[model samples]
Target chain A: HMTVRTRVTDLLEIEHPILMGGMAWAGTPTLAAAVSEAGGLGIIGSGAMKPDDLRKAISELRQKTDKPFGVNIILVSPWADDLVKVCIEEKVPVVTFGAGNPTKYIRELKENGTKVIPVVASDSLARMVERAGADAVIAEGMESGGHIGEVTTFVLVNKVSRSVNIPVIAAGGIADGRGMAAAFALGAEAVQMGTRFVASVESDVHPVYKEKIVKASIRDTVVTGAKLGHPARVLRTPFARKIQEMEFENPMQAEEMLVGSLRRAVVEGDLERGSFMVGQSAGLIDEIKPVKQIIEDILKEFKETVEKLRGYIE
Target chain B: HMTVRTRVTDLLEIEHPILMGGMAWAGTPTLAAAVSEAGGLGIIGSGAMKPDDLRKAISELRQKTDKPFGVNIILVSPWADDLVKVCIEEKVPVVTFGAGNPTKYIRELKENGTKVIPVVASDSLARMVERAGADAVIAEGMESGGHIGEVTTFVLVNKVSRSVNIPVIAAGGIADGRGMAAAFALGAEAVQMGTRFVASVESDVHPVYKEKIVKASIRDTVVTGAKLGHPARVLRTPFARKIQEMEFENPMQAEEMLVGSLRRAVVEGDLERGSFMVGQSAGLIDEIKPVKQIIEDILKEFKETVEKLRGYIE
Candidate 1:
């Protein structure tokens, strides 16, 4: 096994500095366990799930793998308070926050030995979370799937890394070792991948979704939901194109169409009406291998790529 | 001097693979000359300028620095044919096209010993340019100022590199050595920087504009002209924010207000009304210095940063 030591590896107590970012309906307990067992940190995407649901997820994930893992909590969810309670009581090793401010919950999570890492889009938010006692921050860029910020990962990671003293985990448009090495070049200590893991064989995503990711071209993804102010990146499905076409004329109707889109893709493998939420990096994925094989391949590629890059310097 | 011997260096005949992207108003002859003198390729931004104007720009840059330099030609300009004639007549060492396709002129430019490099937003365009006999392609993302496309540089650079056999130069969201090295890791042979040089002491852009770039935070820059179908990134000024606010209400009004905006910023330093076009990389800038100092600083940091990244791989 190979190790890439950074403050992230030390803080998360993982052998690798890679992280499969939590994804709702995609980051299942089985998927999380597989990633964690493979030496990287895995997180369950607990999107507004109630306390009992989160507790059961934690319990199921623990049963599969005794390794340390994390839970991604949407701070803006009405169930955030209960989820925080479940995490603190069970003493989850790590909690990554998204959607809203986690300042009020950071202290409680930290007190219970749960490391708080907020997903921020801008350096301002990164500094804010760092000031609020975040152990580290994940700088998610506009190129990633789901909700995104104005700044791109290439610019945001370096900006946030310099703005805050905390270690930075770069997200968005990152699926391979080249992307990982690029993140390190931008001063990121670790990488948080969502779309890359979504295509893994162990991921619970529909086979159609995984195949779409594998067959995607670099420009296959586009941003939708911008009219509703939730600009999310996704594959250019007919459903997503329809939303983009109608969002300008009727935003309310567009919002209605996107309501159960993610679930439709994840649960039913719906292509015509489902939103295949995948990052621009989906173009880089060419296979649906097991989590261990994928992780090992990335380590090998990363070593060779970095070594090749070393000659470009002097 | 340091040399990064990618195919780009050989094609451009420059000691360094770095390039200062031509910017309307900002990339004056003096700035272009200074960059070339520092061993990197420099480009004069010719935004629809007539043959005489472009001829003068090339002549002035040649006078200051005999080293190989380039002229940026907006392909969709009304005077594009005339400008191409000027480049061919003057035998400019390099010609970089932006705004539209350069396929029609690539053959003529190449025959005249002028290297044709098109700035593209997608891999399809990169492939098209390569097929049309372009010396190289600059994959510019939506992060850059002026015209932009749907993809981000972090995603576009690697994507285009894989699609085309021609040398690839990454553009957008690249301002420093970290940005340069990150581009290299993403498969770019070289980097084309715009905003970084806008803040250089040699750039004729108003001092106020340079200060704004230096002071800009990661989120300070915003995209405007999206409604007009020509999305351009610019720093957050009252003028730019005003355009974004009014574009939805009246696109025609926004178009009228943007006319001569760049000239206003370059000549009069009009903060309230000037467009102050710049890339998101403005956030990485900290000071206004000479182009040689900027070039040397980037080379130093690039060597050091790549070495630091090598340790993270194994």
Candidate 2:
């Protein structure tokens, strides 16, 4: 394995500066355990799971691997407080909060010795989380899947890294080693990948979902629901195209069209009308490899890229 | 001056691995000459000028600077053929084509010993340009202003750089030395900047346009005209917000609303109703400095960033 040291790896006690994003429905115990076993931080997405399911998921992850793992709690969810309680009860080592402010729960989570990292889309939000005592910040760009802001990773990562004292983790449109090296150059200490891991063998997503990602082109994904104030990057499906057309006709109904579409794609394998929330990095993922193989390939590529870049400087 | 030798700098005989993007209405002879005199490739935008005005602009640029410069010709314009003729008659050293395919005029331009570069949005298009015997490709991401495709620079630049044998120049979301270094790490030989230069003192845009860019944040820009098949990134304004609302309500009429908005903003200083096209990089531009100062700052920052990144590898 290629070992690299950064503030994120040192603080999180992981071997590599890589983290798997908490993709709803896909970040299952098996996937999380496989990533942790591969020496990277794995995260179990608790957005769609019930409290009991989340508890069982953590238990399953522990049974599979004794390595470090994390749980992602969406702050906008109604059961967010209960999920935090479950995380404390299970003694989860890390928790990544998304979608809203996690200031209220940060003190409580830290009091229990759990590290808290919040995914922020802007520099102001990054500063806010740092002031609220976040251990680190994940600067997610608009090129990422699901909910997004207007800042691209190339701009957001650098600005956020400069604005905060905490380590900055870059996300969005990163699928390979070239992307990882670029992120580090842009001042990110680590990287959080969602679309690439979504195509991993251990992920719980449907086979069609994996296949679609593998076959996607650079222009296949687009941002919808901007007028509704929650833009999401999704693949161009027949259903998604229909929604795009309807969005221009009726903005309110366009917002309603996405309800439960993610579940339809992840669970029912409905490619036509389901919301396949994925980043533009889907264009870079071509295969469904095991998590161990994926991590190894990324490290190898990153090392090779860095060596090539060294020639440019010297 | 901080000198760097890359394929682009060597081929174009410039001092730095930087290019000023051709912004419609703003890329006048004065701005182009200023950038060329500052040791970077300057491009005169020919999209908005008539044939007589184009001829005068090229002549005016020749009078201002003896350095190498280029002319950007939008292929979809009605005067594209005439512009190509003007370029040939004036013996312009380089030509960058955008908006559509320029395959029909590539051989003619090359026969005259003029270098050809096409602005592409995907690897397939990059390959196509290479096959057509083009000199290089500018991989412009959706984060760019005026017109855009679906790819972000973080993903497009690396893929295009790897897929083609020719030099790849990255554009969109690049404003400072950090961004330039990140582009190089992503396999690009150089960067093309538009938004940052839009706020330069040499730029011929209205004072109000530059001020708005200086005051803009990361999320201030939004993509409009997507339904019309010609998406543009513009700053958020009362006028732009109205266009966004109308786009969903009346797509065709919304398209009509932008016909002369660019000129209105550039010449009339109408911030409320004009189309102020710019990239997400506007957030990084905080002041209106001269072209020489802007280039010097970018080079200094790039050198410092590269020195700092060397610590990561070893």
Candidate 3:
């Protein structure tokens, strides 16, 4: 029922052109396995895991689901080299990247039968990765949670999609099937969503964090790190709001304040000081559902959307 | 050949689900007329014109093209009341409001067979306009040129489209057919473009301004006046860059520097002092074409995109 074919889906060998975001602090075995079993590509984020921990997690993930899955290696992780080695040795089906470029490791990963897909905010980076043997590139926009780029999904998706020949997986500000169809319309072959998956029932995030996402309005999220040059979108909580003020008053100190905030929100639901990372799509989400049900509803909505679009054209 | 119908196209009596931006100084009779004649809704921006000036332009635009067109009233204009009166007296086919809500004038305007469309950046404004009898609401995003709101088009289009019963015209960061299809996918009944039209052959803007847009990259534009609370997107030029710095060091002084900068660019081609207003889609444009060709290309592209989309679904 989830069958959809695009270069991205075919290359990643997934049933649908849907992929869960490789988010740090929240992307866990439970959530990733649920998504993979539901016929989408689920990714375990390696940023928060040690080399041994990731190796064990991969086996644990395999036990939960025999489906195809991947691991996202945040290049800035101190143990990134070790994580990449594990991915190559284990021959993970796919390896998505973040925090830095994945060009240095692309050839080795691809040779080992692991697809490389690096997340980028601009078409220039996408072009570079495409040359370096990336299976695809995720054009994530500024509206995404945690770390983000300067471009919006509306502009970046089309820009990067056309800039590179490889399939583009659009990320940011997408919560439903309408958005997935929109991404496809913008020339993206697949949609990689972070915020929507983070709000899913299977997500390992704290209940309070999920509740905050459900209750947030469109403007309830603010871009906090623009002044600090590493802009990130986040839910406008007291902690974020305080950071917002300090960004202009004391930018350097504001950066210091943001350290470990995302972990606080995901691990402990630290409402007072945690950085509640949420995308601009928070307004579109009012409830959380199981990963399986979420995928089902999205596909149905996408089918209905195609019908409506056909009526609009000659 | 440009026959596409939606709530926006049907209500506005346009052949295609395409609308040109109501940009001040640039949205003149020559450009608007060309767009209208080419089967899309064009608009003469009333922000730069006085009451009588607008009336003269309306008749001039009529002489150039008999098809339906609109007049966008900048609500903050000192003569906004007179401009609305002129629109009512002339009984223009449509009226798009900006800067402020058009609630008080919607009744009189629509009573004269004029369709009311308000340019909004948030769902709340879209809902308000719908409740007050707007024919449709243009959900313009922060990626648009000139004055902008906080939301990106990706989030705002979906949020506002679902929030109201009225047709939504997605504006900002749209340059070609892929973007138009993406907008429709985001629940927009139509797409409105500014930067694309500004570089069209029919546009009266200076060659220098047009060339700047064609030569720009995705990151060439910068958002100014953000610190002053009235944010606007413009091409990054020496003058605009200076203002960007001034905005941080001396915000009040930066406001003074912006006065008449857009006029300098549009009328005098003052690259040194002009604020060459452009959207994020400036990077997508590489050449200028006649209005007729631009519409034809966009429609063809939209058709191709829809076909490719059909291929992705089972």
Candidate 4:
């Protein structure tokens, strides 16, 4: 029943169909609120932060902008219960859940009138979320930064869009307006971008992190933990490659040490000791610009791409 | 006036748009004539063959197919004069040249009314051929199997198409109909596919070589000989990997032995020792079918793709 007209722009009521993802550790209140005010939905990342921290971040974001924004909680993390309570208390208009089952939270959030969107990878995962009461789904393919699900955005978005009755948001490796248009062509209603936004001037991450993302290429990412049975994709760096080789040597030892090192790498930006998280889509990124510039460029590209698509329709 | 519509079909007026390369060792008279009979321009690879053998191969191809086909004579080879004489005496309809300058031969071939298409990799090279009386130029990118040039197909085609006056036939990694369509989109009049065709049942190579080509993904190919000071692209295998490693370990060792050894791999189908001559375009290939089916599928896909291009024309 979905048509090309039912695009991310139409659904989100934004100037563009691009959504800036809540990158944990790097996504700060200033970045989140600025994106929201700029006409894109900006979700504040609450990964495993304490309830008080989540509240302060949300409160700070609210103070910066009156526009609609969301808060993201890693549902698989131990502090998910506290984060959910914080989201409720803060009266966040929208909530995005990642890395865990979102059924209970989705039902609860919807009951309270908060729109719920869960990040899902496969068609089966999408159906489960849609049936269990998610208002929408963010289809995150394996190409996403941080923790990801296996499948490229193209195949994953198509499968999820076709399977689910709810609106599907495409994520993973999408940085530019052409990617946004490609996502729409693949049936995604909207695109949720993480890496591209992380490289923006408004991002709170270390300058080193943003610089690395800008210089990356398509072949610069590799999936690790396959031997360890976890399967996480990370930037192809010395540490990440070491983990792959370590896993090749002893798979059992790999997973046991991964999380500890990954946390130090991502949270501390210690490139030597840990790995910088990024997506395959980072290859298209070449420069770091202001959040407003990023948003405007994406919108411009999206509009042109859509116009081009219109030329093809007849 | 170079419209997209102009690219949708092969301008080359051979039996079919497809053309076989003059692959040394594997380029026998039987294979060449068989390909010609099957409706594609075939070439007797006479690069390393003796003058007698070249004459025999040309005669055999002539005997089998009264259709249009050519003989490949490497202009840089020591026996280039004899090879050209054989093609002239055999009265071949076409003569494809590779690895050397073909200005004199182009003039003679054109005088004799035999179509002269020179294989080149750059705009400068294309212009050289165009000024040399060549009827067409095969813009062979780094994606072709065997001894290859440096530029990628996209870059090479755009450069040659923009600069040259003659018809530009895109060669290298074109494997499927979409690839053919892409070549046309890039301003090529035709596409030359060697590795893709080599996977066909009509190819005289070992089944293992064909199987490798069929099963190849985008990751299966790599460019070597850059540091060896003579760049060639080939399939990534243990042998190629070893050569790469040796380049790093003892840089001087890469220059002497491996070039010929690499050729032996493709020509003899020696998996451990033979270099699998391929281009990065191997990623698009998925199976080995008959040559006719391959051509039909490509044409069908090309039509559908062009039709699909309408969807992007807004």
Q: In candidate 3, which residue pairs clash?
A: none
User: How does model 3 score by TM-score?
Assistant: 0.97
Q: Which of 1 and 3 is ahead in DockQ?
A: 1
* Candidate 2 per-residue lDDT over residues B28-117, each given as its tens digit: 899999999999999999999788988999999999999999999998889999999999999998899999888889999999989999
Q: Which residue pairs in model 4 clash with each other?
A: A8-A189, A308-B314, A311-B313, A311-B314, A312-B310, A312-B313, A312-B314, B218-B283, B265-B274, B265-B275
Q: Model 2, A191-246: lDDT tens per residue?
A: 99998988988888899999999999767887777657777899888888788777
What count of clashes does model 2 give?
Answer: 0
Clash totals for all candidate models: 0, 0, 0, 10
Q: Per-candidate TM-score, first chain only? A: 0.97, 0.97, 0.96, 0.91
CA-lDDT, candidates in order: 0.87, 0.88, 0.88, 0.71
Task: List where candidate 4 sits over 4 angstroms from the true fold.
Answer: A1-6, A250-253, A260-263, A306-314, B1-314
By DockQ, the better pick of 3 and 4 is 3
Best by DockQ: 1
**Model 1 TM-score on a 0 to 1 scale:** 0.97
Ranking by DockQ: 1, 3, 2, 4
Model 4 reaches an interface RMSD of 8.6
Q: What ordering of candidates by lDDT runs from best to worst?
A: 2, 3, 1, 4
State the lDDT of candidate 1 residue by residue for A1-314, as single tens digits.
65678999999999988898878888789999999999999999998377888889999999999999999998778888888888888888999999877898898788888899999998778888899999999999898988788899989998998889899999998888888889998989999898888888889888999999999987899789877888888899878889998888799999998888889988899998898878888878888888888888878777877888887755
